Design a protein around this ligand. Structure first.
Ligand code: HEM
Ligand SMILES: [O]
Length: 293
């Protein structure tokens, strides 16, 4: 008995309602740009979207973005989530202004907004995630380890029903933001353009000269002359033949990367949710820049 989480739109709420919430996060993203030495809050908002979705198990429909269990001490306090309470705190003023949206709709819309606002692809979003009880919070250990190889990555992602293409498109988001040693014991950005979404991660992986070096938290990571770093799991995408081909693909076609990332990131944030046929079509939100805001 895998669980059935069916979507329930928040009462009366339509598109205008969720576009208002998107503009609140976008306007706050402009205003609070100082964060993490001017990278701003976009990156960690994408990593919260991903970490609140990525607990899912396709075998039993436990985990995932449906029930917003990240708000419970257990998951909140997971070591793999070291750092995301910056993102949770960012979102708090917004949930108080719109007390009506559910936690998983807010945690997943937060990440859509961050990608779009950083000039990433339009990501279609569907509402209806419903907050479930403290007891439904999955246990710690479901999120990936950064110290492992291509085989680890493939097998890990099979649990969320992610194929290689989907994994490499998903990993392109590591063009964003940075690893911070106090959080994960890894230190460095992956590139120059930390807070605008591009295929820079692929170009860097193929063209930078990486060196395997150990960091002050005594973990190995791959380092470039230009001040960039790759995690062992990041680097494995060029070590494996099946992944290297798709990295070389996104490296040479920015629009293919945009398109696949949008599909794969929409799927990761929808895993586990049944949508009724009567449920509305996905929303596509205008950015502030398309709204002349
Ligand atoms: C093999 C799988 C993956 C591993 C092991 C992994 C691991 C990590 C690690 C170690 C960090 C640094 C966190 C910190 O020190 O603050 C990080 C950051 C980040 N990851 Fe992942 N990640 C993986 C896949 C993904 C995917 C699929 C996405 C989303 C589409 C994602 C998005 C991000 C983002 C946006 C950050 C930036 C955080 C910030 O600057 O605040 N990661 N990840
Ligand atoms: O991540």
């Amino acid at each position: 008995t895998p669980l059935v989480h069916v979507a329930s739109v928040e009462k009366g709420r339509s598109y205008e309602d969720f576009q208002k919430v998107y503009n609140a996060i976008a306007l706050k993203l402009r205003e609070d740009d100082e964060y993490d030495n001017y990278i701003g809050y976009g990156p960690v908002l994408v990593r919260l979207a991903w970490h609140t979705s990525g607990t899912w198990d396709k075998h039993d429909n436990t985990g995932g973005s449906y029930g917003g269990t990240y708000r419970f001490k257990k998951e909140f306090n997971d070591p793999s989530n070291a750092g995301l309470q910056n993102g949770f705190k960012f979102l708090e003023p917004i949930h108080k202004e719109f007390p009506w949206i559910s936690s998983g709709d807010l945690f997943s819309l937060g990440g859509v907004t961050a990608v779009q606002e950083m000039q990433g692809p339009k990501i279609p979003w569907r509402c209806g995630r419903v907050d479930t009880p403290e007891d439904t919070t999955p246990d710690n250990g479901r999120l990936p380890d950064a110290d492992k190889d291509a085989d680890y990555v493939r097998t890990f992602f099979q649990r969320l029903n992610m194929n290689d293409r989907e994994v490499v498109a998903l990993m392109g988001a590591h063009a964003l933001g940075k690893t911070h040693l106090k959080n994960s014991g890894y230190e460095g950005p992956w590139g120059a353009a930390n807070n605008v979404f591009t295929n820079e991660f692929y170009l860097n992986l193929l063209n930078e000269d990486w060196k395997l070096e150990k960091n002050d938290a005594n973990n190995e990571q791959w380092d470039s002359k230009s001040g960039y770093m790759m995690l062992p799991t990041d680097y494995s995408l060029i070590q494996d033949p099946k992944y290297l081909s798709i990295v070389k693909e996104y490296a040479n076609d920015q629009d293919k990367f945009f398109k696949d990332f949008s599909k794969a990131f929409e799927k990761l944030l929808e895993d586990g949710i049944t949508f009724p046929k009567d449920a509305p079509s996905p929303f596509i939100f205008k950015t502030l820049e398309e709204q002349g805001l």
